[PDB]
Amino acid sequence: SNADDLQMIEMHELIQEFYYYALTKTVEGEQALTYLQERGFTDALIKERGIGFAPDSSHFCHDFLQKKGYDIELAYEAGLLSRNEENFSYYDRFRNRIMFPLKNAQGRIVGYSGRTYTGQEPKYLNSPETPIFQKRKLLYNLDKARKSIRKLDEIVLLEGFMDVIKSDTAGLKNVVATMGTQLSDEHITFIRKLTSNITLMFDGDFAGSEATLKTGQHLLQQGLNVFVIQLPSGMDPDEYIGKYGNDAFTTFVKNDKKSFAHYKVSILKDEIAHNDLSYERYLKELSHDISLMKSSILQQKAINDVAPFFNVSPEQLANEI
Numbered sequence: 001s002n003a004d005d006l007q008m009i010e011m012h013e014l015i016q017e018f019y020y021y022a023l024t025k026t027v028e029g030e031q032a033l034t035y036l037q038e039r040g041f042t043d044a045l046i047k048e049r050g051i052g053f054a055p056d057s058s059h060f061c062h063d064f065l066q067k068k069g070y071d072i073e074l075a076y077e078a079g080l081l082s083r084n085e086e087n088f089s090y091y092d093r094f095r096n097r098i099m100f101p102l103k104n105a106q107g108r109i110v111g112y113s114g115r116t117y118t119g120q121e122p123k124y125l126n127s128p129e130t131p132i133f134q135k136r137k138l139l140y141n142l143d144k145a146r147k148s149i150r151k152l153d154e155i156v157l158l159e160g161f162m163d164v165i166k167s168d169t170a171g172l173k174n175v176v177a178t179m180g181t182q183l184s185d186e187h188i189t190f191i192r193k194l195t196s197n198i199t200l201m202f203d204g205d206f207a208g209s210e211a212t213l214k215t216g217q218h219l220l221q222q223g224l225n226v227f228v229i230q231l232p233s234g235m236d237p238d239e240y241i242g243k244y245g246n247d248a249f250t251t252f253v254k255n256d257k258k259s260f261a262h263y264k265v266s267i268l269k270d271e272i273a274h275n276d277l278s279y280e281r282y283l284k285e286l287s288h289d290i291s292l293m294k295s296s297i298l299q300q301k302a303i304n305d306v307a308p309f310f311n312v313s314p315e316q317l318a319n320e321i
């Protein structure tokens with residue numbers, strides 16, 4: 001029910017104040033606080049994002065929600081507590097982790113991501129699927145980013161929320177991320193209503209490139225204008241900002257932004273030039289990709305940009321399309 005949903009949100013927003021105090025003021029939170037500060041988190045940013053710490057007692061959240069008069073079983077359903085199936089007892093789902101509030105599109109806290117700071121597994125522990133937290137629908141930072149996305153007529157998708165937090169601080173405000181999932185049909189439906197331009201900036205490794213190609217292809221099929229920013233090898237936005245600074249980052253992002261077709265053929269460059277079988281297959285693929293582009297202006301430029309990779313003229317490629 002909507003009433004139960006509201007209680008679940010309340011639980012999240014009330015415990016947030018407690019997590020925040022635990023992180024910034026208490027003895028047990030000291031090491032977690034140092035970890036964040038060494039990663040460049042100022043006290044202002046921690047306060048701004050409402051970042052906190054979950055103690056290791058296993059009944060910190062439980063006792064708090066109990067004292068406030070919340071139904072314990074509902075707290076379990078809200079994904080704040082876990083349940084011992086043998087004894088049917090309840091305990092904290094989040095223990096000894098740095099707590100990042102996950103807000104819905106309306107800016108209400110509906111879940112948490114808890115990061116280890118002592119090399120534990122998993123590195124990031126998210127809320128499970130609940131009536132108020134659904135990974136296929138939630139986009140991290142969307143609540144804050146919406147205004148700039150509409151103003152700039154562009155959304156930038158990163159791999160993880162940590163990169164979003166850093167990028168936002170650096171001056172790139174139209175950024176979001178999924179909670180460790182592939183971009184869903186629901187997400188795409190949400191995004192489409194805000195803008196027709198989406199830029200993918202995943203990590204600069206093999207997995208990021210593969211994800212760029214898969215996500216990009218799907219977005220293209222859905223009729224969106226897809227762009228790609230390619231980070232230096234082995235780097236993500238958080239690492240770039242930490243190494244080169246804020247101004248260097250926002251300049252980099254503004255510099256090399258390629259249409260998806262151009263990015264795709266540049267990745268396939270060597271195979272195309274050496275494998276005649278791949279040459280023919282990718283010529284057909286890129287032709288199809290370019291045909292999907294809704295922008296007549298960008299379509300024509302993609303033709304000019306892609307043709308040299310196949311050693312054909314723009315006119316010949318246009319004919320193939």
Ligand SMILES: Nc1nc2c(ncn2[C@@H]2O[C@H](COP(=O)(O)OP(=O)(O)OP(=O)(O)O)[C@@H](OP(=O)(O)OP(=O)(O)O)[C@H]2O)c(=O)[nH]1
Pocket residue numbers: 121122123124159160161162163203205206207208236238
């Ligand atoms: N041992 C362990 N590693 C994890 C876990 N979760 C994520 N990682 C790895 O941490 C690396 C980067 O994490 P990300 O998902 O990119 O998020 P981050 O913003 O980098 O978090 P962070 O800054 O480290 O706190 C990746 O290495 P790759 O580049 O090889 O990933 P891949 O197979 O994609 O090449 C992940 O595989 C985990 O639960 N356990």
Ligand SMILES: [Mn+2]
Pocket residue numbers: 203205207208
């Ligand atoms: Mn990676």
Ligand SMILES: [Mn+2]
Pocket residue numbers: 159160203236
């Ligand atoms: Mn990363």
Ligand SMILES: [Mn+2]
Pocket residue numbers: 162236238239
């Ligand atoms: Mn990282």
